[PDB]
Amino acid sequence: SPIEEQATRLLKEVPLIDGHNDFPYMIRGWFRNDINGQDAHLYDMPIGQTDLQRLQKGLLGGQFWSAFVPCPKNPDKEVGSLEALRQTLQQLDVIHRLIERHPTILQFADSAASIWSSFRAGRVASLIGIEGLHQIADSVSALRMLHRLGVRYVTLTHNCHNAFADAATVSPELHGGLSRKGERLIRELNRMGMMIDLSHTSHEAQTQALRLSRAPVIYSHSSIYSLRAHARNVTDENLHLLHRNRGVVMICFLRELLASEADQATLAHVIDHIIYAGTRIGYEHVGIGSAFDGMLRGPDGLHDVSCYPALVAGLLERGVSEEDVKRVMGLNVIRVLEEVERVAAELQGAGEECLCDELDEVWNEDIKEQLTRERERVRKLG
Amino acid sequence: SPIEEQATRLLKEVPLIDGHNDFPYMIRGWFRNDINGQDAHLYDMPIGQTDLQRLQKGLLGGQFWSAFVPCPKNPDKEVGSLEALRQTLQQLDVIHRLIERHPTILQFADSAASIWSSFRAGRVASLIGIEGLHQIADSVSALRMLHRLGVRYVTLTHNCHNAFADAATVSPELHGGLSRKGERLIRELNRMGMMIDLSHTSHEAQTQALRLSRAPVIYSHSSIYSLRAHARNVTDENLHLLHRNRGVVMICFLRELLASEADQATLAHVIDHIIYAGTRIGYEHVGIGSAFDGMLRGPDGLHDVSCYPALVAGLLERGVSEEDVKRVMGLNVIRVLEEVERVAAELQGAGEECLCDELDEVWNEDIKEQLTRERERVRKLG
Ligand SMILES: [Fe+3]
Ligand SMILES: [Fe+3]
Ligand SMILES: [Fe+3]
Ligand SMILES: [Fe+3]
């Protein structure tokens, strides 16, 4: 087939960079993050939509691997979020060990340049995102350390409200979009060079963040409200604000977001959604956000990570130009990451003040007097 | 003075690398880790034994900055250790921001090579240690992430027992040295290339770790039991085991560890302790571990970080050779870090199994059957 040869050539020329894959949580589910002597199973998994053989077979160029942990179910919500932070480090650790152990297939990447050098070496550029601010345990310090561990996007919520923003699937609303803390955090995310992810957040939270952010954002895995009404899909109002933001909506493979009858969802629906967004807000603002392994079963023709050539072929068959297909494959999300880096270097370069955690005083006034008195004794020595 | 000119030349030729400084906890105490617009105060502090001006004045070559947090005082010891992990990330964050904000004075280092290139650039090589395994919240995954954030040594305890080892200052003993978990952790610390620190640990814990470790260890800030009996000082038995281990005892400036009458402790006592150890186990196994800012007041002649030239001068005056002084200044701790790297590359190269956290099952048996059945449906597609 000439269209399938074309698709393969495109997958060789530029990377397909997928916005969301929960393979790391499948590794927690199945192996409990103990992958010692499990290579054969990592290449050919007994469960799930991802493994190292099928990953190569789909000619995928890059992947934001999700370091998701569930919303905390502890009745003490302080201890729940603290437990989530620890679980987040467990997920980042298994992601890093997965990459370190299979260096011929996976190569860690945290930038536009490192995506490209990984792709030129024939490897799947392996980036990291966290799926909810419940994972940082109310600590902006923790967030910056997650960034330093390779986290490059932060989904603001999962399916739970947090101190910063409202999730889409939970009602009643807590903050009615972003909180006051949340608004401050947008600035800090821009300042540190963390990509903002608006998937799972409420329509109002999206609107507010899209107005506030000084860097482009993504939807790592969301589809299009006008084609299928769901709290998790992007309204025309927020697609418009995404255009002005210069961001990317990475179209989702979740059947519940593609069609009213989940079991009728199909490869064609994913293409319908890509083409809807590309037509209306431009093909430079749409990408691919599978959310593979955040689902049991995928749509017909997109059952697992081996099916990406079928999506590329499908888009070309519907008259999307090579150049535009290359954009939705990967170029757009690379641009956003590039612009997120540039905005952070600009703000750090201007010497913008970083957000600091509210800490308890550890010293009483007696200790502070002891310390200042001791300092002056040292000053008076000569 | 010709001896002071000699000392200055030595401080230019090789780095003085100090084993322990709690300036980061002073920054938490005084600023609550908010150093925005505080440069003038960071250069000339109103409290403590460390600031950026006095750091330059002492001609210090490198520093392991402590990311210490207190032993958890919560009656629920699960929530206490989880809180400590979060506080650890707060301390690592302020250390990293301190270094990033003053790049002409401080340069981050995590290796022998990065110490040297920092020293050749005229900067204080800034390494990181954590002071107790209470700080990792029973998570070996967290430990590896701390390593990836730049932590290069781990003091096994502070002044509290943990799941892994016994602190010196607490009785009764919990494990009687290391626990079974603790013995396993020694292997993992060797495997990941984390330097083991035996300061604050019990005499029995030291003996066991010194027998078990396949890489050299340090005492980041301990002095010599035979000169002054204290639970925190190193016995002749453990100095012997340190020699066979090939490790380094970094001599402490804490007055309580130098003399029975704290207020009589003096620069000469620090030199007595260095010379004791260097004479008996060799000058290649002794270093400098001030523990500045883990004390209110230091000994006469070693009041703050500007006093290092006096220590170098003091050692030369007592007939310690240039070459041996250069060793205790920095060469020895650099060797240990070098050997800790080499041992880790050897064990990772042999494909040694890494230690994994004991995790809860997240999926029941119904979910696993659903997932395996779904996998076979995908296998049967063609
Ligand atoms: Fe997910
Ligand atoms: Fe999701
Ligand atoms: Fe300390
Ligand atoms: Fe200490």
mmCIF file of C-alpha atoms in Angstrom, chain B residues 63-326:
data_model
loop_
_atom_site.group_PDB
_atom_site.id
_atom_site.type_symbol
_atom_site.label_atom_id
_atom_site.label_comp_id
_atom_site.label_asym_id
_atom_site.label_seq_id
_atom_site.Cartn_x
_atom_site.Cartn_y
_atom_site.Cartn_z
ATOM 1 C CA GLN B 63 31.179 21.039 51.239
ATOM 2 C CA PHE B 64 28.668 18.303 51.859
ATOM 3 C CA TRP B 65 25.623 20.413 52.764
ATOM 4 C CA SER B 66 23.313 18.579 55.178
ATOM 5 C CA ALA B 67 19.646 18.225 54.194
ATOM 6 C CA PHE B 68 18.878 17.281 57.814
ATOM 7 C CA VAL B 69 15.366 17.258 59.211
ATOM 8 C CA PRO B 70 14.626 16.474 62.888
ATOM 9 C CA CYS B 71 13.607 13.023 64.083
ATOM 10 C CA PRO B 72 9.795 12.904 63.801
ATOM 11 C CA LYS B 73 7.944 13.720 67.054
ATOM 12 C CA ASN B 74 4.424 12.745 65.864
ATOM 13 C CA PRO B 75 2.939 9.961 68.081
ATOM 14 C CA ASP B 76 1.874 8.202 64.829
ATOM 15 C CA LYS B 77 5.351 7.195 63.553
ATOM 16 C CA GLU B 78 3.981 6.422 60.041
ATOM 17 C CA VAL B 79 2.766 10.040 59.649
ATOM 18 C CA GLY B 80 5.961 11.353 61.276
ATOM 19 C CA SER B 81 8.298 9.679 58.778
ATOM 20 C CA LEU B 82 6.028 10.698 55.867
ATOM 21 C CA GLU B 83 6.233 14.301 57.133
ATOM 22 C CA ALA B 84 10.044 13.938 57.338
ATOM 23 C CA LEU B 85 10.218 12.855 53.667
ATOM 24 C CA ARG B 86 8.311 16.001 52.688
ATOM 25 C CA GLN B 87 10.593 18.114 54.887
ATOM 26 C CA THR B 88 13.621 16.448 53.238
ATOM 27 C CA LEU B 89 12.407 17.610 49.793
ATOM 28 C CA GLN B 90 11.997 21.088 51.281
ATOM 29 C CA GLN B 91 15.632 21.026 52.423
ATOM 30 C CA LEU B 92 16.946 19.647 49.109
ATOM 31 C CA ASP B 93 14.977 22.382 47.351
ATOM 32 C CA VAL B 94 16.470 25.215 49.443
ATOM 33 C CA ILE B 95 19.996 23.743 48.964
ATOM 34 C CA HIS B 96 19.491 23.612 45.164
ATOM 35 C CA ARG B 97 18.037 27.133 45.067
ATOM 36 C CA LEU B 98 20.926 28.472 47.231
ATOM 37 C CA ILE B 99 23.418 27.007 44.721
ATOM 38 C CA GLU B 100 21.447 28.178 41.621
ATOM 39 C CA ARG B 101 21.142 31.734 43.000
ATOM 40 C CA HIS B 102 24.867 32.134 43.859
ATOM 41 C CA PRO B 103 26.641 30.416 40.925
ATOM 42 C CA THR B 104 29.887 32.435 41.345
ATOM 43 C CA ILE B 105 30.403 31.012 44.884
ATOM 44 C CA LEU B 106 28.691 27.602 44.823
ATOM 45 C CA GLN B 107 28.632 24.894 42.135
ATOM 46 C CA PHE B 108 26.673 21.660 42.553
ATOM 47 C CA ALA B 109 28.797 18.487 42.543
ATOM 48 C CA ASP B 110 27.859 14.776 42.768
ATOM 49 C CA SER B 111 31.163 13.077 41.838
ATOM 50 C CA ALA B 112 34.947 13.193 42.103
ATOM 51 C CA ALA B 113 35.167 14.729 38.617
ATOM 52 C CA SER B 114 32.504 17.395 39.333
ATOM 53 C CA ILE B 115 34.285 18.331 42.613
ATOM 54 C CA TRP B 116 37.502 18.896 40.635
ATOM 55 C CA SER B 117 35.950 20.934 37.785
ATOM 56 C CA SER B 118 34.134 23.067 40.401
ATOM 57 C CA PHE B 119 37.397 23.592 42.320
ATOM 58 C CA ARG B 120 39.326 24.451 39.100
ATOM 59 C CA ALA B 121 36.615 27.060 38.338
ATOM 60 C CA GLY B 122 37.266 28.705 41.757
ATOM 61 C CA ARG B 123 33.952 27.590 43.313
ATOM 62 C CA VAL B 124 32.928 25.711 46.440
ATOM 63 C CA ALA B 125 31.952 22.204 45.337
ATOM 64 C CA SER B 126 28.490 21.772 46.823
ATOM 65 C CA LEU B 127 27.493 18.185 47.544
ATOM 66 C CA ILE B 128 24.537 16.925 49.562
ATOM 67 C CA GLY B 129 24.032 14.390 52.364
ATOM 68 C CA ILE B 130 20.911 13.405 54.351
ATOM 69 C CA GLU B 131 21.320 12.885 58.102
ATOM 70 C CA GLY B 132 19.193 9.811 58.956
ATOM 71 C CA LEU B 133 17.078 7.077 57.323
ATOM 72 C CA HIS B 134 14.012 8.479 59.104
ATOM 73 C CA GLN B 135 14.170 10.951 56.166
ATOM 74 C CA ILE B 136 13.305 8.296 53.513
ATOM 75 C CA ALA B 137 9.998 7.166 55.118
ATOM 76 C CA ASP B 138 10.794 3.437 54.795
ATOM 77 C CA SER B 139 11.044 3.821 50.985
ATOM 78 C CA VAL B 140 14.079 2.546 49.091
ATOM 79 C CA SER B 141 12.438 4.100 46.002
ATOM 80 C CA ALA B 142 12.500 7.461 47.786
ATOM 81 C CA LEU B 143 16.203 6.868 48.609
ATOM 82 C CA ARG B 144 17.061 6.309 44.918
ATOM 83 C CA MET B 145 15.151 9.468 44.004
ATOM 84 C CA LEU B 146 17.106 11.405 46.668
ATOM 85 C CA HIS B 147 20.275 10.053 44.992
ATOM 86 C CA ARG B 148 18.960 11.287 41.637
ATOM 87 C CA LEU B 149 18.368 14.720 43.270
ATOM 88 C CA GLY B 150 22.078 14.844 44.228
ATOM 89 C CA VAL B 151 22.229 13.154 47.647
ATOM 90 C CA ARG B 152 25.632 11.448 47.851
ATOM 91 C CA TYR B 153 25.885 10.247 51.442
ATOM 92 C CA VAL B 154 23.307 8.886 53.859
ATOM 93 C CA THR B 155 23.904 9.036 57.601
ATOM 94 C CA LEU B 156 22.131 5.880 58.730
ATOM 95 C CA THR B 157 20.583 7.475 61.831
ATOM 96 C CA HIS B 158 20.364 10.853 63.580
ATOM 97 C CA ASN B 159 19.447 10.697 67.341
ATOM 98 C CA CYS B 160 16.623 8.210 66.801
ATOM 99 C CA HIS B 161 16.423 4.521 65.949
ATOM 100 C CA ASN B 162 14.802 3.698 62.600
ATOM 101 C CA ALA B 163 13.741 0.515 60.766
ATOM 102 C CA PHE B 164 17.362 0.068 59.553
ATOM 103 C CA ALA B 165 19.801 0.954 62.401
ATOM 104 C CA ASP B 166 20.467 2.105 65.977
ATOM 105 C CA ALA B 167 21.455 5.682 66.849
ATOM 106 C CA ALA B 168 24.239 6.137 69.413
ATOM 107 C CA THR B 169 22.532 8.637 71.766
ATOM 108 C CA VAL B 170 19.293 6.598 72.283
ATOM 109 C CA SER B 171 19.009 3.609 74.646
ATOM 110 C CA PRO B 172 17.733 0.963 74.984
ATOM 111 C CA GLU B 173 18.949 -0.511 71.673
ATOM 112 C CA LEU B 174 16.212 -1.463 69.157
ATOM 113 C CA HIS B 175 18.084 -3.768 66.713
ATOM 114 C CA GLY B 176 21.457 -4.101 68.505
ATOM 115 C CA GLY B 177 23.256 -2.514 65.569
ATOM 116 C CA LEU B 178 21.646 -3.029 62.138
ATOM 117 C CA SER B 179 18.263 -4.637 61.487
ATOM 118 C CA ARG B 180 17.641 -7.312 58.858
ATOM 119 C CA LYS B 181 16.244 -4.517 56.654
ATOM 120 C CA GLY B 182 19.405 -2.531 57.470
ATOM 121 C CA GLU B 183 21.751 -5.298 56.275
ATOM 122 C CA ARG B 184 19.854 -5.469 52.962
ATOM 123 C CA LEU B 185 20.014 -1.678 52.610
ATOM 124 C CA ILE B 186 23.856 -1.682 52.889
ATOM 125 C CA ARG B 187 23.959 -3.780 49.695
ATOM 126 C CA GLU B 188 21.565 -1.371 47.920
ATOM 127 C CA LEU B 189 23.524 1.715 49.029
ATOM 128 C CA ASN B 190 26.670 0.068 47.582
ATOM 129 C CA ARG B 191 24.776 -0.845 44.414
ATOM 130 C CA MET B 192 23.358 2.654 43.746
ATOM 131 C CA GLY B 193 26.627 4.478 44.575
ATOM 132 C CA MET B 194 25.463 6.192 47.760
ATOM 133 C CA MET B 195 28.227 6.839 50.281
ATOM 134 C CA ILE B 196 27.440 5.293 53.692
ATOM 135 C CA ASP B 197 27.862 7.670 56.672
ATOM 136 C CA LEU B 198 28.343 6.090 60.130
ATOM 137 C CA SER B 199 28.219 9.257 62.284
ATOM 138 C CA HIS B 200 25.322 9.227 64.808
ATOM 139 C CA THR B 201 25.108 5.395 64.638
ATOM 140 C CA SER B 202 25.866 3.069 67.556
ATOM 141 C CA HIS B 203 29.267 1.382 68.006
ATOM 142 C CA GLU B 204 27.658 -1.990 67.173
ATOM 143 C CA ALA B 205 25.925 -0.604 64.060
ATOM 144 C CA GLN B 206 29.310 0.744 62.894
ATOM 145 C CA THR B 207 31.038 -2.620 63.389
ATOM 146 C CA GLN B 208 28.344 -4.491 61.436
ATOM 147 C CA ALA B 209 28.199 -1.993 58.558
ATOM 148 C CA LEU B 210 32.023 -1.855 58.318
ATOM 149 C CA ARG B 211 32.092 -5.662 57.979
ATOM 150 C CA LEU B 212 29.193 -5.712 55.472
ATOM 151 C CA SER B 213 29.909 -2.792 53.109
ATOM 152 C CA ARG B 214 31.577 -3.594 49.786
ATOM 153 C CA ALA B 215 32.430 0.126 49.299
ATOM 154 C CA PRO B 216 34.357 2.476 51.610
ATOM 155 C CA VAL B 217 32.297 4.495 54.092
ATOM 156 C CA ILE B 218 32.752 7.753 55.986
ATOM 157 C CA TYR B 219 32.143 9.254 59.354
ATOM 158 C CA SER B 220 30.966 12.694 58.122
ATOM 159 C CA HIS B 221 31.429 14.253 61.592
ATOM 160 C CA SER B 222 32.770 12.080 64.406
ATOM 161 C CA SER B 223 35.815 12.330 66.646
ATOM 162 C CA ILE B 224 37.992 9.800 68.537
ATOM 163 C CA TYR B 225 36.723 7.785 71.517
ATOM 164 C CA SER B 226 40.174 7.096 73.039
ATOM 165 C CA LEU B 227 40.820 10.854 73.412
ATOM 166 C CA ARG B 228 37.266 11.613 74.619
ATOM 167 C CA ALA B 229 34.702 8.938 75.525
ATOM 168 C CA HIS B 230 31.271 9.661 74.011
ATOM 169 C CA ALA B 231 28.707 7.448 72.251
ATOM 170 C CA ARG B 232 29.241 9.610 69.117
ATOM 171 C CA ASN B 233 33.018 9.051 68.819
ATOM 172 C CA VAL B 234 34.796 6.218 67.014
ATOM 173 C CA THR B 235 36.319 3.373 69.063
ATOM 174 C CA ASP B 236 39.730 1.884 68.274
ATOM 175 C CA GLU B 237 37.884 -1.300 67.233
ATOM 176 C CA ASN B 238 35.841 0.632 64.639
ATOM 177 C CA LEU B 239 38.879 2.709 63.500
ATOM 178 C CA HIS B 240 40.520 -0.644 62.710
ATOM 179 C CA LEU B 241 37.469 -1.808 60.759
ATOM 180 C CA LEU B 242 37.447 1.589 59.010
ATOM 181 C CA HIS B 243 41.039 0.927 57.823
ATOM 182 C CA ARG B 244 40.090 -2.452 56.300
ATOM 183 C CA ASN B 245 36.971 -0.825 54.779
ATOM 184 C CA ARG B 246 39.316 1.859 53.239
ATOM 185 C CA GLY B 247 37.061 4.638 54.593
ATOM 186 C CA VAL B 248 37.535 8.068 56.153
ATOM 187 C CA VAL B 249 36.837 9.458 59.637
ATOM 188 C CA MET B 250 36.079 13.171 59.165
ATOM 189 C CA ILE B 251 37.085 14.837 62.426
ATOM 190 C CA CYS B 252 34.389 16.862 64.124
ATOM 191 C CA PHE B 253 34.466 20.380 65.662
ATOM 192 C CA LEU B 254 31.659 19.665 68.186
ATOM 193 C CA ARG B 255 33.037 20.746 71.596
ATOM 194 C CA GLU B 256 31.157 17.978 73.436
ATOM 195 C CA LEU B 257 33.113 15.390 71.372
ATOM 196 C CA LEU B 258 36.548 17.062 71.798
ATOM 197 C CA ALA B 259 36.812 17.521 75.594
ATOM 198 C CA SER B 260 35.064 16.594 78.878
ATOM 199 C CA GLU B 261 34.684 20.321 79.620
ATOM 200 C CA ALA B 262 32.994 21.649 76.436
ATOM 201 C CA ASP B 263 34.024 25.283 77.039
ATOM 202 C CA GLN B 264 37.742 24.242 77.095
ATOM 203 C CA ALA B 265 37.616 22.709 73.576
ATOM 204 C CA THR B 266 40.050 24.248 71.163
ATOM 205 C CA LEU B 267 41.653 24.131 67.661
ATOM 206 C CA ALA B 268 44.541 22.084 69.154
ATOM 207 C CA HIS B 269 42.031 19.345 70.196
ATOM 208 C CA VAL B 270 40.847 18.990 66.584
ATOM 209 C CA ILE B 271 44.506 18.629 65.555
ATOM 210 C CA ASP B 272 45.105 16.095 68.386
ATOM 211 C CA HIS B 273 42.220 14.013 67.036
ATOM 212 C CA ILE B 274 43.365 14.200 63.389
ATOM 213 C CA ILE B 275 46.922 13.217 64.413
ATOM 214 C CA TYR B 276 45.680 10.371 66.653
ATOM 215 C CA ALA B 277 43.774 8.778 63.763
ATOM 216 C CA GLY B 278 46.402 9.536 61.097
ATOM 217 C CA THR B 279 49.150 8.010 63.221
ATOM 218 C CA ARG B 280 47.207 4.820 63.989
ATOM 219 C CA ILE B 281 45.167 4.068 60.829
ATOM 220 C CA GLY B 282 47.145 6.242 58.366
ATOM 221 C CA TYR B 283 46.644 9.805 57.109
ATOM 222 C CA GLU B 284 44.863 8.475 53.989
ATOM 223 C CA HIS B 285 41.829 7.567 56.213
ATOM 224 C CA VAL B 286 41.108 10.867 58.036
ATOM 225 C CA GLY B 287 39.327 14.062 56.953
ATOM 226 C CA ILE B 288 37.534 17.160 58.226
ATOM 227 C CA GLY B 289 33.874 17.042 59.304
ATOM 228 C CA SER B 290 33.208 20.370 61.027
ATOM 229 C CA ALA B 291 29.495 20.008 61.716
ATOM 230 C CA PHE B 292 29.356 23.831 61.624
ATOM 231 C CA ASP B 293 25.786 25.052 62.241
ATOM 232 C CA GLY B 294 24.974 21.844 64.136
ATOM 233 C CA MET B 295 26.273 23.772 67.153
ATOM 234 C CA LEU B 296 25.765 27.194 68.746
ATOM 235 C CA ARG B 297 29.450 27.855 69.468
ATOM 236 C CA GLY B 298 32.622 26.208 68.126
ATOM 237 C CA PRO B 299 36.060 25.677 69.711
ATOM 238 C CA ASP B 300 38.648 28.472 70.159
ATOM 239 C CA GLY B 301 40.270 29.155 66.791
ATOM 240 C CA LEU B 302 37.441 27.349 64.899
ATOM 241 C CA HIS B 303 34.481 29.635 65.519
ATOM 242 C CA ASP B 304 33.188 29.634 61.913
ATOM 243 C CA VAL B 305 33.837 28.676 58.254
ATOM 244 C CA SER B 306 36.469 31.456 57.885
ATOM 245 C CA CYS B 307 38.832 29.539 60.232
ATOM 246 C CA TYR B 308 39.909 26.677 57.894
ATOM 247 C CA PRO B 309 43.327 28.275 57.062
ATOM 248 C CA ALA B 310 44.091 28.144 60.808
ATOM 249 C CA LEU B 311 43.419 24.369 60.866
ATOM 250 C CA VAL B 312 45.689 23.795 57.830
ATOM 251 C CA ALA B 313 48.387 25.981 59.408
ATOM 252 C CA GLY B 314 47.907 24.152 62.728
ATOM 253 C CA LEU B 315 48.447 20.715 61.141
ATOM 254 C CA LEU B 316 51.629 21.815 59.324
ATOM 255 C CA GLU B 317 52.997 23.311 62.569
ATOM 256 C CA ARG B 318 52.685 19.896 64.284
ATOM 257 C CA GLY B 319 54.806 18.239 61.568
ATOM 258 C CA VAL B 320 52.120 16.633 59.404
ATOM 259 C CA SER B 321 53.638 16.586 55.896
ATOM 260 C CA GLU B 322 52.187 18.664 53.039
ATOM 261 C CA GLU B 323 51.111 15.501 51.241
ATOM 262 C CA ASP B 324 49.360 14.164 54.379
ATOM 263 C CA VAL B 325 47.708 17.527 55.101
ATOM 264 C CA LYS B 326 46.443 17.593 51.467
#
